[PDB]
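Lab notebook, bench 4. The sequencing result for the construct came back, and we need a structural model before the next group meeting so we can plan mutations. Quick request posted to the team channel:

Model the 3D structure of this chain.
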Amino acid sequence: HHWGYGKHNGPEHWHKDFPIAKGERQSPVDIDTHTAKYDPSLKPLSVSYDQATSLRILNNGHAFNVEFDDSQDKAVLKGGPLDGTYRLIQFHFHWGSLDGQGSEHTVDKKKYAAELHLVHWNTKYGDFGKAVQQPDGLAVLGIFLKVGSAKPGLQKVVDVLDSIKTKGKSADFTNFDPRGLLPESLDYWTYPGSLTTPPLLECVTWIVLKEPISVSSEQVLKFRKLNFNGEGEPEELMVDNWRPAQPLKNRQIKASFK
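Done. Here's the predicted structure in token form:
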């Protein structure tokens, strides 16, 4: 029926409705650190989020999205392996039922507790919908979360989850600064890949940060209280909404550092 993360509609079944699931540039992947090639020609990333305008937070039934105003060049990503400017449209997370799983990308097979995706689209394409149809339409910044100390900047997000508990619920969410979710270092790995949920389009340049951010056990606990179901349906907690690693095939992972 419709896709999800269960036994009957889970990642292993997506190919029936989205044949691109078995494509040549699917994400996520395992990052083998000893096989990644340092490329001295990659430039430092440029994150300009000082003018970011958040608008809303929504439970879409597969995760929660924080959405931003992308009608102008307010929060953009450039540099790194990118040509052109990419505007931030939304961020979302992927997490586990336990602290030992939850990320989509893995590092030398290590799984993190969660993974944050900051989604950006190439301005040359005019809108998000046109950008997903192009090989270089999107740039996603992935950041791993490990459990340790609390991340102060994530607390405003944690506190509004009670209000968007079930599918289709949304809440006003203005004045959130995504700079509070960045690690100290911007060192990264990069490879050409895809969206990690249907429609799984191969239009992403992935930018995976080497340095994880830490969140407290209590912070991650609140994510696991969300629901997949809609209001008044039998309760199914929103946990394990991650797609396992896909074959690298003909691709190279490059590193910005040695």
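The first strand starts at residue 30 and ends at 31.
Will bring this to the meeting.
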